[PDB]
Design a binder for this molecule. Structure first.
Ligand code: HEC
Ligand code: HEC
Ligand code: HEC
Ligand code: HEC
Ligand code: HEC
Ligand SMILES: CCCCCCCCCCCCCCCCCC(=O)OC[C@H](C)OC(=O)CCCCCCCCCCCCCCCCC
Ligand SMILES: CCCCCCCCCCCCCCCCCC(=O)OC[C@H](C)OC(=O)CCCCCCCCCCCCCCCCC
Lengths: 37, 72, 218
């Protein structure tokens, strides 16, 4: 069974955006809790 | 809001001669229960008595102390 | 289509995304506030009642640290100077000066000068300058260039982690004594080798012992 959104231009872009958001959040959190002191 | 209050510090105007700040001293004094003296060595944290102990060179108080001398 | 407009799909997805971003932002703000310089009073020159300048007396007049903080190497407490030490110079120097009036107000009455404590520990930490100084640590890798400080500020927040970083890795901060010598001392390029050699020579205990609770807290 295909996903409902299969065959959409927006799928790769939304996945990318979610990954970029996540990476940014992770780096910022890491900096504050590990390197900011 | 801040981690802690100003915590001002007040020093001396003339230092005591034999005192090193933050180092307790010990002085020899006598405490009497029935009118009979028992030698005691008492710790003076900063010029204030804080802990009574026994005087090893005093007969009837060789290090050991009675509860009444401790609770003075 | 029954009860919602066309853009409700985008609005709902963006609302979820914004809610997650807001939660992350709130966590970040809380952490930053609790690790801020304003909260911990770092790099803030606390104004003093008598306006004493370490730069003038140390860097210009040239007075040793132990002339004022005389108990630093013998007890846990670095003796804050008495008015007697202040008056040994100012009975003759800069007498009849409006900014030395408070000092002259003391030494005539028994009232002390209420300095504001810059470096403050929460009375369950039990620090000791004596062992530290004697073991090859100076008030430059431990306090800052106080020699050039018109108004003393807190160089770093005294975190539990800060103390534990150097208690665990003391070979990056240990110096060859001369710790009271003017803090013009600069660590050499081969700090690691010299630090290891000094750790071996002074007999500094491994982190198995220096990170125990009753080392600091009692
Ligand atoms: C042994 C494993 C412990 C435990 C359980 C704790 N510490 Fe420490 N501690 C040290 C310093 C300088 C501070 C002050 C931190 C600051 O001012 O920001 C602390 C503080 C703590 C806390 C916080 C208490 C609070 O109410 O906020 C706690 C929970 C704590 N410690 C636990 C210094 C040291 C040490 C220096 C060598 C070491 C060792 C320890 N602490 C060890 C412990
Ligand atoms: C040699 C360069 C030093 C170092 C490393 C320090 N002092 Fe002093 N000091 C003096 C007085 C009267 C004060 C209190 C007034 C004020 O804080 O402005 C101080 C204060 C300090 C501090 C901070 C105290 C605190 O509570 O955190 C520190 C870390 C410090 N000193 C280190 C007096 C003198 C003095 C004249 C008698 C001279 C010389 C020194 N200090 C030298 C040093
Ligand atoms: C005890 C901790 C103190 C305090 C509170 C101060 N001093 Fe001194 N001081 C000394 C010298 C040679 C000078 C400069 C002389 C000059 O400017 O002509 C000073 C200066 C000061 C000032 C500034 C006064 C002004 O600018 O007019 C202040 C506020 C001050 N001191 C406070 C010499 C000594 C000294 C060695 C002889 C010692 C010890 C102290 N001072 C101690 C203190
Ligand atoms: C690196 C510059 C350090 C900082 C930061 C702190 N301490 Fe320290 N401490 C340091 C050394 C090189 C030593 C000697 C260790 C030895 O075994 O000789 C110490 C030791 C102490 C001790 C005594 C250890 C003991 O076994 O009794 C105490 C109580 C101590 N240090 C306290 C302490 C605190 C509370 C600190 C944070 C404010 C702290 N030290 C930071 C080096 C360094
Ligand atoms: C380890 C880092 C050091 C070293 C080697 C020195 N200082 Fe000290 N100092 C330090 C702490 C963590 C504190 C706070 C103490 C507290 O109870 O909160 C202090 C404090 C002082 C003070 C204030 C008076 C006092 O607390 O006794 C003075 C003055 C002071 N330190 C001066 C000082 C001098 C002259 C040193 C020799 C170079 C020195 N410190 C070393 C941390 C450390
Ligand atoms: C989320 C809510 C968490 C429960 C409320 C916690 C508030 C605790 C504040 C206690 C400190 C205080 O009230 O003292 C006055 C302080 C200086 O003044 C303050 O700092 C007030 C701080 C308010 C914090 C509000 C958090 C949002
Ligand atoms: C529940 C999750 C944790 C929410 C924060 C609870 C503790 C907040 C607090 O007690 O603040 C006290 C602080 C001393 O007072 C302060 O420092 C002021 C607080 C500034 C805002 C910090 C909170 C922003 C929102 C946090 C959301 C997570």
């Amino acid at each position: 069974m295909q996903p409902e959104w299969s065959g959409d231009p927006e799928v790769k872009p939304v996945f990318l955006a979610v990954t970029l958001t996540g990476m940014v959040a992770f780096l910022l959190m890491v900096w504050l809790f590990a390197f900011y002191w | 809001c801040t981690y802690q209050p100003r915590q001002y510090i007040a020093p001396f105007d003339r230092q005591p001669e034999g005192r090193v700040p933050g180092i307790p001293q010990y002085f020899a004094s006598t405490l009497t229960l029935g009118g009979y003296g028992t030698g005691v060595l008492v710790r003076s944290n900063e010029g204030r008595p804080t802990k009574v102990e026994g005087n090893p060179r005093h007969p009837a108080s060789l290090g050991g102390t009675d509860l009444f001398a401790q609770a003075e | 289509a029954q009860i919602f407009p066309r853009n409700a799909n985008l609005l709902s997805r963006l609302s979820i995304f914004a809610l997650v971003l807001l939660v992350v932002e709130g966590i970040l703000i809380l952490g930053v506030y609790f690790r801020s310089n304003y909260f911990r009073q770092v790099n803030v020159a606390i104004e003093q009642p008598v306006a004493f300048s370490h730069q003038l007396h140390v860097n210009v007049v040239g007075i040793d640290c132990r002339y004022c903080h005389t108990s630093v190497d013998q007890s846990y407490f670095a003796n804050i100077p008495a008015t007697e030490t202040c008056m040994t110079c100012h009975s003759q120097i800069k007498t009849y000066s409006p900014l030395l009036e408070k000092v002259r107000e003391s030494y005539a009455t028994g009232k002390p000068i209420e300095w504001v404590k810059v470096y403050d520990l929460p009375n369950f930490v039990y620090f000791n300058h004596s062992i530290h100084v004697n073991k090859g640590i100076g008030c430059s890798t431990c306090h800052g260039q106080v020699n050039n400080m018109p108004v003393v500020w807190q160089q770093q927040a005294l975190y539990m982690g800060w103390c534990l970083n150097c208690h665990r890795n003391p070979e990056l901060y240990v110096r060859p004594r001369e710790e009271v010598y003017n803090m013009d001392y600069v660590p050499p390029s081969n700090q690691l080798e010299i630090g290891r050699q000094l750790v071996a020579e002074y007999g500094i205990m491994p982190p198995d012992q220096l990170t125990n609770c009753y080392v600091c807290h009692r």
